[PDB]
């Protein structure tokens, strides 16, 4: 299936290629209900729908159009484990050097 594991540095183009959406707002969740934040840390469009094959907000409640993204939801339409593999990226305003390459001794 696969030979050796390769480790290298992460270019900003490589980190934008990993990503699926810029995580802007720090707002985690709503906390008074059950819904998350659009668009905060735990987003919908950047990552995926909490429920499997469902727009979290409201459209597609069967198995026909898996993928459509309406403007009222700003949500993808895939599996419950799809968010576990998808990662976001934070556009750091000011450059910050890595601590692992500045203090490794």
């Amino acid at each position: 299936e696969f030979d050796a594991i390769k480790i290298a540095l992460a270019s900003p183009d490589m980190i934008r290629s990993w990503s699926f959406g810029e995580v802007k707002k720090p707002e985690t969740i709503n906390y008074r209900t059950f819904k998350p934040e659009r668009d905060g840390l735990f987003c919908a469009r950047i990552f995926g729908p909490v429920k499997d094959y469902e727009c979290l907000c409201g459209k597609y409640k069967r198995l026909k159009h898996r993928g459509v993204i309406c403007e009222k939801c700003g949500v993808e339409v895939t599996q419950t484990k799809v968010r576990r593999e998808r990662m976001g990226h934070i556009e750091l305003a000011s450059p910050t050097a890595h601590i692992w390459f500045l203090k490794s001794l």
Binding site: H65, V68, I69, E71
Partner: protein, 205 residues
Amino acid sequence: ARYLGPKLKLSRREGTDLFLKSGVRAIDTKCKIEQAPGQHGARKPRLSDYGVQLREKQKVRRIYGVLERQFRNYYKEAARLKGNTGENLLALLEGRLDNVVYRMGFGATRAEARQLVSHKAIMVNGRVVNIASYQVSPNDVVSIREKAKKQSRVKAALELAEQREKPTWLEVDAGKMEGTFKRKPERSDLSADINEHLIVELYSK
């Protein structure tokens, strides 16, 4: 010439959220969106073949706020035009000035947008257009005029839109309050739940 009654009732009847209210407050809180209107709401027997089609037609009409004769005319036009009929119809519907405005985000609802259009707030290529049914063309810039630019409602609408997903077929500026209708939208850009085909069939009786 307009539907002036309860908006959420229509939505309830349809089954779906038609976006007849701004979207500050969720539709489930404002009304029993699952339950149909009237005394006999909880009862829900499977509809007929004709009936489903009719319902579908209503939904679309409701969404845009287009009465029957006009709708029929639009359908006819679509049929006349080359390409897929339902798609064409959809495009035509989109093309309406009020709808475009709504998309841009100068109206909270489509109704609001329509009202704005009526009240000589909107200009298309620097010329005040008052007709909600005005079919906006490709590359036709459409803007709020300087008199109506100070209104608090407009900014609210814009804000609402910003929360809502941005359509690919337009390009809008919040500061300038002018949007360019870049191209007539593809079927993929529009909502998937609308069965245009049913509508087409209904008129092809």
